[PDB]
């Protein structure tokens with residue numbers, strides 16, 4: 001792998017069947033990496049593979065429900081064999097949202113969002129650890145959110161899971177430093193995805209969304225690839241001194257207050 | 260309650276038999292509030308109740324294991340009955356620490372700490388919400404940790420629970436603002452509690468603690484009364500405009516880097 005590329009590096013991207021995860025598979029696939037992604041739908045993944053492999057991308061995928069502990073274990077074994085026990089990149093992107101007020105959450109909502117958004121990321125990280133070390137140049141990137149540092153409507157529990165993940169990111173950077181593993185987080189602002197799409201279907205969430213874009217310096221939504229570009233850089237051998245950092249690609253929304 | 264006192268206010272402080280929590284009961288009550296506390300050791304509570312009552316503090320205590328959804332409800336009912344359905348202050352202080360590296364955490368472990376550290380506080384706040392509202396001047400104060408924002412050894416997961424709490428603190432201040440409730444967090448540094456006394460029994464950890472103390476401006480351990488002091492003020496009517504804050508009572512710990 002070169003200073004500004006991932007030629008040869010292997011990688012696992014959770015939830016790459018849509019949006020940002022998809023933007024990330026393509027970004028790394030295009031920079032030389034061999035990718036392996038997953039989602040809860042085979043037919044969807046297959047349509048993704050058809051598109052990816054048509055551009056010369058070295059990609060492979062398989063159905064997996066990250067909300068299930070036992071499955072995540074199976075996923076790690078398969079990917080491991082696939083990459084011959086050597087994984088350079090782990091992009092913990094899969095995440096879901098449940099728009100409700102704090103007090104309106106059912107044990108079902110809370111347990112689901114926490115297993116998928118945090119548990120799963122924490123869990124996979126640990127499962128991938130021995131392979132990242134053996135790679136001798138591992139990188140773990142967590143996809144956070146601006147919502148894990150600042151309050152947003154209906155995202156209290158969702159931010160709670162992203163705020164947990166960021167502390168995890170920070171601590172792991174220090175525990176795995178000796179294992180050659182750099183650990184970083186990337187907090188997206190508002191990026192145009194299927195998740196954001198289903199969202200604006202609601203007249204309230206749409207009004208709430210335009211508030212966000214207005215509070216931006218760029219005042220527009222990001223593109224799955226503007227986000228993916230930051231994730232890719234963090235994986236190059238060029239980002240060698242960068243670890244334990246949480247970086248936001250929000251078009252300036254984190255720096256705002258009265259604009 | 261005057262601008263600088265708590266006379267007439269009612270409050271619940273989880274985990275008041277020892278440490279910071281014991282310290283908080285004494286401070287709020289000393290300031291005229293009517294407290295109710297809990298812990299998993301009845302005999303200890305009884306020694307405390309005898310201590311506090313001896314000096315005239317108005318306080319009640321029941322046994323409850325916060326790691327249990329049912330027991331928590333049980334507690335909210337009594338408390339509410341005890342205080343006639345009006346709760347002014349809720350202080351989510353209970354917490355445990357399990358010093359293992361993120362990858363060495365077992366499920367029982369992750370479940371235990373996540374359950375006590377973040378779940379119960381979240382759950383207890385919601386359950387309390389109705390009487391906090393009825394009181395007409397509700398205050399919720401989550402006891403976080405410096406480890407909730409920065410890497411500390413063996414506290415990767417613990418820190419994740421505080422990072423989740425911290426985000427929830429911010430959001431709740433906004434969701435419950437119209438209910439006339441203020442929500443903040445108080446992140447301790449190194450306070451001399453029984454948890455610490457226990458922690459430094461291990462040589463390696465004794466070394467780790469000293470690392471921190473040498474890392475704070477005031478180069479010393481704070482006292483429970485010193486953490487209680489910051490919690491009693493956010494509850495004072497004098498602190499009416501403070502909401503959504505995470506304040507650190509750490510002797511300078513959070514401002515250091517090269518000292």
Ligand SMILES: NC(=O)C1=CN([C@@H]2O[C@H](COP(=O)(O)OP(=O)(O)OC[C@H]3O[C@@H](n4cnc5c(N)ncnc54)[C@H](OP(=O)(O)O)[C@@H]3O)[C@@H](O)[C@H]2O)C=CC1
Nearest residue numbers: 015017018019020039040065066095145190191193194195
């Ligand atoms: N788009 C935005 O504006 C922002 C997104 N984010 C974060 O970015 C990440 C991606 O979100 P985004 O692209 O918007 O969302 P999308 O819904 O567009 O994509 C999420 C992807 O994750 C996959 N996924 C979800 N749950 C599982 C599961 N249990 N098992 C396997 N795959 C799963 C989905 O596949 P499937 O549904 O088929 O299972 C899908 O491919 C998340 O962590 C989100 O919190 C944060 C801030 C902003």
Ligand SMILES: NC(=O)C1=CN([C@@H]2O[C@H](COP(=O)(O)OP(=O)(O)OC[C@H]3O[C@@H](n4cnc5c(N)ncnc54)[C@H](OP(=O)(O)O)[C@@H]3O)[C@@H](O)[C@H]2O)C=CC1
Nearest residue numbers: 274276277278279298299324325354404449450452453454
């Ligand atoms: N001491 C320090 O330096 C720091 C402490 N903190 C935070 O301060 C808070 C208190 O810590 P500290 O005073 O040091 O700890 P202590 O161990 O001294 O006291 C903790 C108290 O919480 C109670 N408790 C724990 N679990 C439960 C439970 N499941 N149900 C009911 N009560 C419970 C304990 O009682 P029992 O065991 O008998 O049930 C005890 O009375 C925590 O949130 C901790 O994370 C954060 C940073 C620094």
Ligand SMILES: CN1[C@@H]2CC[C@H]1CC(=O)C2
Nearest residue numbers: 145146147189190196199
């Ligand atoms: C609506 N909401 C906005 C943008 C996408 C979605 C998740 C988030 O973190 C903030």
Ligand SMILES: CN1[C@@H]2CC[C@H]1CC(=O)C2
Nearest residue numbers: 404405406448449455468
């Ligand atoms: C050692 N470690 C320090 C101080 C007490 C213990 C827990 C914590 O949160 C930070």
